[PDB]
Design a protein around this nucleic acid. Structure first.
Lengths: 134, 123, 18, 175, 79, 148, 112
RNA sequence: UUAAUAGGGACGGUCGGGGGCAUCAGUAUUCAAUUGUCAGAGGUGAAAUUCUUGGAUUUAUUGAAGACUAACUACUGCGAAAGCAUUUGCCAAGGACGUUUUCAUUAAUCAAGAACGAAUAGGGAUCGGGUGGUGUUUUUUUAAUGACCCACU
């Protein structure tokens, strides 16, 4: 219910005072990418450490495209990675604790979001079909 | 006594308080150097202490002036004066409060704060 | 007063980190 | 010597300020001191060297207790008598829910304030359900009866057995 | 008590950043002078990270929930 | 008090506990404020083990508008912790008579007052109890040092 | 001026307990209670019975030597009524008339 | 081809009497013991039942067992509901806020079925977060965290 999101500006050019080019940034991406940071945390690290309005303005491609072209694409989309990591860690908290029935309600709300996202990605073929997260 | 700060602690650290005075404490026998007993005076935790050692120790001395004002005001059997303490080198403003009692004993008061250790470590 | 006091004490700042 | 004191919330304050002169008259009947502090919101009853009896100061404590629970002042000044006993029982510590406190609270107070007042006919007491307390003044037998009825009524015991009970008992003492 | 065509900027700037006529951000950039060096870095106004300088890797600002706290070694230009 | 020695139409006693009357704390507890307590187990210089309690209440500031002025439920963690480290400092020093000499003019309360004010100001704070359970030994030697 | 004690009035319901002790509270004297002074098993907290037993309690204490005494009023306490009993006011008024002293009194209701 | 006042995900300070484990405190009740002491104590409209000189009840000192967080405690908070009040530590989970980070229709509603539970638009006050300040207060300490005053959402 709670409205909270990012409001991108009107003018899709930017900033008319930034000095460097995309080549300065394209090199900067891959070293951060090969360092082991997730593409979410790249755009985290880009906007605050250096000055970039949005990386799809100085570069006419997505940041995921530059990792996909230069051979840094991961095994799955980055959003489903954490949903894997959350589902194991709660299960790991449940293999220690047999009393927290409050936690057992939380697993289904995790798994059902995993299921509905699994059908979409396997349909649009970023994942091969017959893939299953058990 | 009522002061601008409530009294935190008053600590006897004289040698006679630990039974180590070479002469036994004799009333009115002030010719022996073991006579004046050292007493620490600590006031409460307060930001009334300046960040410079001369104004700190002179602030302590003016507090001892107000205590001397109450003491001479209402404790006329007690006697009191002020002395210097160059046994801490280059700290030229430590003033001891000397009180002579009708039991024949003499004490000296010297004020310890929390602002001391920070300024000396800063030096 | 106050702002100069901050300037000097946080100059002991630039000697307090560095 | 002995000094008792209490506090109040703010919806009693200006009323107390309007009746404080009759407070100091009725307490001046028994040589009792009283001090009204606004900045804490405290009343304070004390004894003086010109006191006659000490025990009256206990009643004084009760009176300022009965001004914390918003009792009307002419009803309140009865406790400075001799044959007049007071009681404050706390009703806040029975229900964790607010709604079921409301359930047996309203089942206690009944329709239109009838049933509760019916107890004040079969006890001849004064009963004020003051929020999270029952404050009851009156004779001692009635304080036994009201204590039994309240301390059954916060639990699942219905008031109709109590009013039938006191009705049949008063009509058998009628005889 | 107003029309939806042109409201005043005094009426506009008090509004929420989403519910405006043309949605646009409010956050800004600035240049950071910390005298351990003399190079400036463009730091976005909301941190989400512990940020240090270019070479004198000490601090520039501290993360909060909202606006970051520039850790006192700064005069700045909002450009 | 607690009896230790007896001598012939005289007997000497020792400090066992300190307690508030019921009228005093039940005077204090007002509606629309927050009751903060603390306890600490701490040893003296001579090995008297004593557990004291603590009472803390929130006041309103000048020009308050709101009727309650509660805490934040994390400042109470910031309040209990400041009292806890102060009470361990003052105990284990200069055996309990000087600690009794601090409890009587309640010097302890101002030390609680000044330090914890930077978090949230406060009102009435007192000590409310001290009780002992681990007296070491008979030990007449230090007992007669207080006598005249 | 005087030799002191504590009177510890326990004013329960259907009975009143009064017993003066020493300053320590382990040594007892004159334990006589209100229920003793009439035999009907009903008026055991009546104030004339409370005034009766408080006279005889102050009688023996005046015959041993105790002349000044603190009182500690006390109700039943705990999950009980928490209310001072019937024979508490007149009984405190009874022994204060007997020729003793009353000063600096307080409450020992167990209010948990 | 855009990045929905469609939906999902990441990050930052937080909030919560939300949950699990483990730990600490408190008086009160009961039982047992020791000491002072010695005729009644309980109960009801009485009456009766019970205990009692190997001492009942009361009093002072202990130990044991179980149980719960009393004034604060609210038309407030949290949880999907049933429900949730001592301190402290650990383990994860959650919401709002902020966000110029990210996916790109991934959406919604509901037989069968499973888990868990008997079984139209204003006004005033309040909770959490954020922003601003011709602002105060703690500052005889240089700073500052923090509470407060007012506006905005």
């Amino acid at each position: 219910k709670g409205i909270s999101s990012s409001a991108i500006p009107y003018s899709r050019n930017a900033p008319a005072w930034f000095k460097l080019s995309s080549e300065s940034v394209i090199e900067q991406i891959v070293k951060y990418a090969r360092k082991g940071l997730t593409p979410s945390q790249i755009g985290v690290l880009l906007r605050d450490a250096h000055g970039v309005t949005q990386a799809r303005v100085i570069t006419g491609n997505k940041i995921m495209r530059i990792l996909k072209s230069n051979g840094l694409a991961p095994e799955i989309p980055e959003d489903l990675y954490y949903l894997i990591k959350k589902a194991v860690s709660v299960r790991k908290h449940l293999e220690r604790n047999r009393k927290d029935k409050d936690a057992k309600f939380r697993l289904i709300l995790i798994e059902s979001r995993i299921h509905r996202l699994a059908r979409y990605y396997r349909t649009v073929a970023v994942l091969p079909p017959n893939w299953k997260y058990e | 006594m009522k002061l601008p700060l409530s009294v935190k602690s008053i600590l006897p650290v004289g040698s006679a308080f630990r039974y180590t005075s070479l002469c036994q404490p004799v009333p009115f026998a002030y010719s022996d150097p073991d006579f004046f007993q050292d007493v620490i005076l600590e006031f409460e935790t307060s930001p009334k202490w300046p960040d410079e050692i001369t104004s700190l120790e002179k602030a302590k001395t003016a507090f001892l002036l107000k205590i001397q004002e109450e003491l001479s005001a209402n404790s006329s059997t007690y006697r009191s004066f002020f002395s210097r303490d160059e046994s801490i080198p280059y700290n030229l403003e430590i003033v001891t409060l000397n009180i002579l009692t009708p039991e024949g004993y003499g004490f000296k008061f010297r004020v310890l704060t929390e602002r001391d250790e920070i300024l000396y470590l800063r030096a | 007063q106050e702002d100069v006091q901050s300037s000097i004490v946080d100059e002991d700042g630039f000697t307090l980190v560095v | 010597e002995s000094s008792f004191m209490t506090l109040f919330p703010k919806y009693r304050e200006s009323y107390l300020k309007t009746i404080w002169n009759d407070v100091t008259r009725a307490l001046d009947k028994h040589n009792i001191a009283c001090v009204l502090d606004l900045v804490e919101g405290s009343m304070t009853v004390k004894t003086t060297r010109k006191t006659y009896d000490p025990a009256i100061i206990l009643k004084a404590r009760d009176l300022i207790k009965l001004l914390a629970r918003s009792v009307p002042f002419p009803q309140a000044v009865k406790i400075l008598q001799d044959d007049m006993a007071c009681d404050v029982i706390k009703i806040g510590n029975f229900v964790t829910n607010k709604e079921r406190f409301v359930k047996r609270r309203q089942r206690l107070v009944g329709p239109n304030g009838n049933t509760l007042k019916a107890l004040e006919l079969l006890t001849k007491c004064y009963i004020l359900v003051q929020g999270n307390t029952v404050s009851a003044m009156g004779p001692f037998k009635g304080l036994k009866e009201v204590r039994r009825v309240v301390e059954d009524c916060m639990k699942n015991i219905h008031p109709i057995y109590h009013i039938k009970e006191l009705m049949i008992k008063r009509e058998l003492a009628k005889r | 008590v107003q029309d939806l065509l042109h409201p005043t900027a005094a009426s506009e700037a008090r509004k929420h950043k989403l519910k405006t006529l043309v949605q646009g951000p409010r956050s800004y950039f600035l240049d950071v002078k910390c005298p351990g060096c003399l190079n400036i870095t463009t730091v976005f106004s909301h941190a989400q990270t512990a940020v240090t300088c270019e070479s004198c890797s000490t601090i520039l600002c501290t993360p909060t929930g909202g606006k970051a706290k520039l850790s006192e070694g700064t005069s700045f230009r909002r450009k | 008090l607690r009896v230790d020695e007896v001598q012939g139409k005289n007997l000497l006693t020792n400090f066992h506990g300190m307690d508030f009357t019921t009228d005093k704390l039940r005077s204090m507890v007002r509606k629309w404020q927050t009751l903060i307590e603390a306890n600490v187990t701490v040893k003296t210089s001579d090995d008297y083990v004593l557990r004291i309690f603590a009472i803390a209440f929130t006041r309103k500031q000048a020009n308050q508008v709101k009727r309650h002025s509660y805490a934040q439920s994390s400042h109470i963690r910031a309040i209990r912790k400041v009292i806890s480290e102060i009470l361990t400092k003052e105990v284990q020093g200069s055996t309990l008579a000087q600690l009794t000499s601090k409890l009587i003019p309640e010097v302890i309360n101002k030390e609680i007052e000044n330090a914890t004010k930077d978090i949230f100001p406060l009102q009435n704070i007192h000590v409310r109890k001290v009780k002992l359970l681990k007296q070491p030994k008979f030990d007449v030697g230090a007992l007669m040092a207080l006598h005249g | 001026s005087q030799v002191f004690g504590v009177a510890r009035i326990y004013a329960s319901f259907n009975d009143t307990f009064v017993h003066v002790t020493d300053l320590s509270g382990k040594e007892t004297i004159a334990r006589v209670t209100g229920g003793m002074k009439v035999k009907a098993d009903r008026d055991e907290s009546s104030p004339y019975a409370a005034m009766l037993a408080a006279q005889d309690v102050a009688a023996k204490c005046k015959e041993v030597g105790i002349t000044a005494v603190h009182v500690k009023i006390r109700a039943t306490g705990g999950t009980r009524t928490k209310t001072p009993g019937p024979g508490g006011q007149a009984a405190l008024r009874a022994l204060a008339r007997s020729g003793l002293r009353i000063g600096r009194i307080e409450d020992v209701t167990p209010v948990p």
